[PDB]
Design a binder for this molecule. Structure first.
Ligand SMILES: [Ca+2]
Ligand SMILES: [Ca+2]
Ligand SMILES: [Ca+2]
Ligand SMILES: [Ca+2]
Length: 240
C-alpha cells in the first residue's frame, strides 16, 4: 500500500519511474541527489506536507534544460497541480497546498540528454509530537528527532522538569523557542551531552515565548525545560 517509513532519503534509488515506486520520504532541510542519464527519463519522489501553506521546490541541475518537474497530490495521479519554471539553472516553483502526501515527478523529453540534479523542498511545516514521561533526568530525555518538530508538553503539579535531547549533525545557529500556552514561570537551559553541568545558554522571555539562538557544533545536546512557579502547558520548537 502506501509506504509509512519515517527514514528520510538523501539519494534516489532506482527504479523510481512512476508514482507507485516513488522514492521517499523527502524531508525539509535534507538535499536529495539524483540524475536522469541515458534512457532513465523519469524519477519520482514523495513528501508529506505537515501543515497547510506554501511549498517551494528548488531543483538546481547541470546538463540539458530540456526537462521539468510536476507535482501531484495523493488521490489524483493524472492532473498535476504545479510545475517548475527554469530560473538560473534550476527549476523552481512555489504552490499552495494542504496537508497530505504529494509526489514530485521529474522527467526529461529527450533520452539522449544527461541531467544531474539536486532537489530541495521547503515549507512543509512541523510535525507535532508529545513528550514522553518519565523524562525527569537526562538519561530519560525525550528525543526531538529533527528540526521540523513541535513538541507538546506540560509541567502540571509534581512534574517540574522535562528533559529533551537533539542531535546537531553540522555546525550552525539553532533557534530554540518555547511557546507558553498558559501563564507560569517556565524557562529552559541547554547543555552538552558530555558535560550536563556546563550550561551553554538559557531561554529569555519575550512576550509569550521563552527563546534564544546559539551557534552549536556537531554533537548531542540536552534541553531541560523546568518550571519555577505555577503550572501549565507549552510547545517547544528547535529550529534551523
Ligand atoms: Ca534517476
Ligand atoms: Ca528513474
Ligand atoms: Ca512534562
Ligand atoms: Ca517530566
Amino acid at each position: 500500500g502506501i509506504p509509512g517509513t519515517t527514514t528520510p532519503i538523501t539519494k534516489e534509488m532506482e527504479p523510481n519511474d512512476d508514482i507507485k515506486e516513488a522514492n521517499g520520504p523527502i524531508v525539509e532541510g535534507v538535499t536529495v541527489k539524483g540524475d536522469l542519464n541515458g534512457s532513465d527519463d523519469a524519477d519520482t519522489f514523495y513528501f508529506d506536507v505537515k501543515e497547510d501553506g506554501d511549498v517551494t521546490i528548488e531543483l538546481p541541475y547541470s546538463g540539458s534544460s530540456n526537462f521539468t518537474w510536476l507535482v501531484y497530490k495523493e488521490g489524483d495521479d493524472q492532473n498535476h497541480i504545479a510545475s517548475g519554471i527554469d530560473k538560473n539553472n534550476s527549476k523552481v516553483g512555489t504552490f499552495k497546498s494542504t496537508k497530505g502526501r504529494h509526489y514530485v515527478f521529474i522527467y526529461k523529453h529527450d533520452s539522449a540528454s544527461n541531467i544531474s540534479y539536486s532537489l530541495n523542498i521547503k515549507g512543509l511545516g512541523n510535525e507535532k509530537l508529545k513528550e514522553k514521561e518519565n523524562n525527569d533526568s537526562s538519561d530519560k530525555a525525550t528525543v526531538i528527532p529533527n528540526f521540523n518538530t513541535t513538541m507538546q508538553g506540560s509541567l502540571l503539579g509534581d512534574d517540574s522538569r522535562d528533559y529533551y535531547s537533539f542531535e546537531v549533525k553540522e555546525e550552525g545557529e539553532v533557534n530554540i523557542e518555547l511557546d507558553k500556552k498558559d501563564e507560569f514561570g517556565v524557562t529552559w537551559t541547554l547543555h552538552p551531552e558530555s558535560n550536563i553541568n556546563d550550561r551553554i545558554t538559557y531561554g529569555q522571555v519575550d512576550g509569550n515565548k521563552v527563546s534564544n539562538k546559539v551557534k552549536l557544533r556537531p554533537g548531542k545536546y540536552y534541553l531541560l525545560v523546568y518550571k519555577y512557579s505555577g503550572s501549565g502547558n507549552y510547545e517547544l520548537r528547535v529550529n534551523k
